[PDB]
Amino acid sequence: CSAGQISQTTTQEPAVNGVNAQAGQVSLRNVHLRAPQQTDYVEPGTTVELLFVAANDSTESNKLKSITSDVGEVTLTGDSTVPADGVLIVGEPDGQIQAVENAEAADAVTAEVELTKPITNGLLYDFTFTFEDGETTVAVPISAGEQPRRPVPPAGPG
Amino acid sequence: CSPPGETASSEPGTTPAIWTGSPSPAAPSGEDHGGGHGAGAAGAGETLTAELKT
Amino acid sequence: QSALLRTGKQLFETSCVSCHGANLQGVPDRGPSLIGTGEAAVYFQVSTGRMPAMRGEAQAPSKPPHFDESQIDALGAYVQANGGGPTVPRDDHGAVAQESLIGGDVARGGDLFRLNCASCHNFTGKGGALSSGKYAPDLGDANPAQIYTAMLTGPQNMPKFSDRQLTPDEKRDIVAYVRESAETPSYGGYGLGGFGPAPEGMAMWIIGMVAAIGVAMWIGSRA
Numbered sequence: 360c361s362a363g364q365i366s367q368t369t370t371q372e373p374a375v376n377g378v379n380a381q382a383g384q385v386s387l388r389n390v391h392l393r394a395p396q397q398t399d400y401v402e403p404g405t406t407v408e409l410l411f412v413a414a415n416d417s418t419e420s421n422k423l424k425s426i427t428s429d430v431g432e433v434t435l436t437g438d439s440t441v442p443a444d445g446v447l448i449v450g451e452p453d454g455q456i457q458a459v460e461n462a463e464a465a466d467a468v469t470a471e472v473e474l475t476k477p478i479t480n481g482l483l484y485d486f487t488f489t490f491e492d493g494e495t496t497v498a499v500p501i502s503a504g505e506q507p508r509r510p511v512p513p514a515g516p517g
Numbered sequence: 518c519s520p521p522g523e524t525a526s527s528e529p530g531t532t533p534a535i536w537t538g539s540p541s542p543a544a545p546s547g548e549d550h551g552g553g554h555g556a557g558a559a560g561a562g563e564t565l566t567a568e569l570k571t
Numbered sequence: 572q573s574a575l576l577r578t579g580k581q582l583f584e585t586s587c588v589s590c591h592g593a594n595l596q597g598v599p600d601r602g603p604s605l606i607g608t609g610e611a612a613v614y615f616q617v618s619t620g621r622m623p624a625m626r627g628e629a630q631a632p633s634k635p636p637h638f639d640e641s642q643i644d645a646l647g648a649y650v651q652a653n654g655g656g657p658t659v660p661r662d663d664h665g666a667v668a669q670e671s672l673i674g675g676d677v678a679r680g681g682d683l684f685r686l687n688c689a690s691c692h693n694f695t696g697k698g699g700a701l702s703s704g705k706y707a708p709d710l711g712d713a714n715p716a717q718i719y720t721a722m723l724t725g726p727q728n729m730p731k732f733s734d735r736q737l738t739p740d741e742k743r744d745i746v747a748y749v750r751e752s753a754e755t756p757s758y759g760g761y762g763l764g765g766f767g768p769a770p771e772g773m774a775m776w777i778i779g780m781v782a783a784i785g786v787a788m789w790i791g792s793r794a
């Protein structure tokens with residue numbers, strides 16, 4: 360009776376770095392920050408990108424995506440009202456394929472944030488995604504999409 | 518019985534500060550030499566850089 | 572590719588939209604969202620066959636794949652385009668790499684396997700048990716691409732080994748060790764499975780002890 364109403368397989372989040380925020384009609388999937396850090400912190404004043412996918416649940420739509428801004432002044436370049444029983448893919452997560460030579464509306468709604476606050480990988484930073492339906496804090500992580508190991512200096516025994 | 522100390526739900530906590538390791542004291546006093554030089558002054562050593570900007 | 576994306580979408584729409592809802596978002600309490608899973612996850616999971624899954628239980632078992640390599644690639648490309656994420660390795664031609672994933676070093680691969688893989692699988696990649704109905708399966712069926720993608724995307728209750736955590740060279744070494752341990756003949760006779768104490772004790776008690784008792788019954792006289 361591992362197959363009962365509470366089963367391990369069904370109640371599993373995706374094995375992805377981005378968090379999931381189902382609150383609100385539009386569901387946020389694989390929401391993370393591309394913020395390549397060269398040191399302990401990503402210093403304020405540097406622009407890091409905000410990846411996620413906004414999937415519409417209802418066909419009756421919530422395609423506004425008004426502000427979705429928090430501490431950092433997230434700006435949505437190439438903003439569009441995409442979600443209509445479909446996906447709004449703000450950016451290009453590492454490994455993303457354009458899927459066609461051309462493109463629609465230039466960039467596909469790329470979200471970029473001027474930090475105004477140090478951030479580091481491993482921490483969770485709250486972002487308030489607000490559609491016309493409602494607002495939800497998501498606690499976005501920092502994800503190193505596909506970058507390999509940065510060479511750490513060799514150690515001199517002492 | 519159960520372990521005396523467990524289950525502290527309250528006090529959510531805080532993010533650890535950036536670690537600032539203290540230098541090794543006389544115990545592990547060994548450290549890398551910063552550069553040997555004559556140093557006929559207060560001391561500069563065998564290491565000195567500079568950036569000429571515009 | 573356009574046609575590859577279209578084929579992946581058509582397969583997705585008539586295979587999994589009931590549990591990975593259309594738009595790749597996950598159906599609450601039926602399946603996780605596939606945004607960000609990537610092409611490697613799709614390749615491993617569908618090729619091992621786990622994904623045409625017909626039950627929600629402790630663990631999704633392996634099974635014959637429901638799609639051929641071309642359809643696996645189509646589904647993987649569709650999922651990668653929708654979400655974007657890790658990609659399965661490929662060789663010079665374009666096919667999923669099998670021999671290229673055999674790392675040169677096998678001692679290093681074995682050390683890494685013992686530190687990370689044997690934790691649950693086995694000393695030599697036989698299966699292992701887990702908490703509640705789960706289990707780490709035997710690795711002898713997996714091919715190098717399947718092992719590499721299994722590490723790349725933690726399939727289920729398995730830690731996700733990123734390239735940063737296990738550089739592709741380390742993963743190639745682990746793949747080499749897995750294949751070598753799986754394809755290596757047991758020196759010293761029939762390795763009874765791969766578990767020493769339990770299969771060895773059963774074989775003692777059944778083969779050696781029944782032989783000894785039967786010989787004793789032959790020699791002696793019932794009374």
Ligand SMILES: CC(C)=CCC/C(C)=C/CC/C(C)=C/CC/C(C)=C/CC/C(C)=C/CC/C(C)=C/CC/C(C)=C/CC/C(C)=C/CC/C(C)=C/CC1=C(C)C(=O)c2ccccc2C1=O
Binds near residue numbers: 762764765770774
């Ligand atoms: C703590 C504890 C014992 C918990 C319960 C776990 C347990 C032993 C459960 C039973 C295992 C079984 C019998 C599973 C099949 C499903 C099941 C329960 C069916 C109903 C049982 C039933 C009433 C059937 C009708 C008649 C009946 C009693 C049939 C029993 C059938 C069997 C399996 C008989 C032989 C007993 C047997 C092999 C038990 C498993 C125990 C061990 C330690 C096997 C060792 C062993 C292993 C594990 C290898 O992998 C291996 C690989 C390569 C070479 C050799 C071996 C080897 O010897």
Ligand SMILES: CCCCCCCCCCCCCCCC(=O)O[C@H](COC(=O)CCCCCCC[C@@H](C)CCCCCCCCC)COP(=O)(O)O[C@H]1[C@H](O)[C@H](O)[C@H](O)[C@@H](O)[C@@H]1O
Binds near residue numbers: 696709712756
């Ligand atoms: C009486 C004295 C005689 C003793 C038996 C001696 C037999 C000698 C055999 C010949 C020489 C040694 C061959 C060694 C080559 C070799 O090892 O043999 C394997 C086979 O293995 C199996 O499957 C088992 C096949 C079934 C036949 C053997 C069964 C004998 C058992 C019953 C003896 C013990 C008694 C226990 C009693 C049980 C009842 C208790 C109530 C075959 O390869 P494979 O099958 O592919 O192994 C997989 C890797 O590949 C793959 O990666 C790996 O991942 C694995 O999957 C691995 O299995």
Ligand code: HEC
Binds near residue numbers: 683684687710711727
């Ligand atoms: C218990 C933690 C765990 C560790 C750590 C782990 N595995 Fe796994 N592994 C599993 C589980 C559980 C599965 C089954 C996943 C599924 O069926 O969806 C699995 C699946 C696999 C498979 C698929 C085999 C098949 O035929 O489907 C391979 C190959 C594999 N693991 C090898 C590895 C490698 C290589 C590593 C690198 C160290 C590793 N394991 C580390 C638990 C683990």
Ligand code: HEC
Binds near residue numbers: 369614624625
């Ligand atoms: C409920 C039946 C079921 C169907 C049918 C199904 N999936 Fe899934 N899927 C799941 C479950 C449950 C998980 C997570 C647990 C697991 O994988 O065992 C999952 C996870 C996945 C993963 C891995 C996610 C991760 O984070 O590693 C991929 C890739 C995937 N599904 C793709 C597919 C594809 C492609 C198909 C159709 C070819 C499909 N699934 C059909 C239920 C299903």
Ligand SMILES: CCCCCCCCCCCCCCCC(=O)OC[C@H](C)OC(=O)CCCCCCCC[C@@H](C)CCCCCCCC
Binds near residue numbers: 360361
């Ligand atoms: C006192 C000893 C005698 C028994 C006394 C009366 C014993 C009376 C036993 C009532 C049992 C009531 C169970 C209530 C279920 C529950 O609420 O929990 C749900 C759980 C989550 O579901 C499960 O996980 C599995 C549940 C199914 C059990 C399959 C057992 C099959 C047995 C076979 C393996 C054959 C064994 C051979 C057995 C051979 C015996 C044949 C009779």
Ligand SMILES: *C(=O)CCCCCCCCCCCCCCC
Binds near residue numbers: 360361362
């Ligand atoms: C998951 O591991 C099993 C799910 C099965 C749940 C329903 C069980 C029905 C009852 C079966 C009766 C068994 C025999 C009773 C002996 C007295």
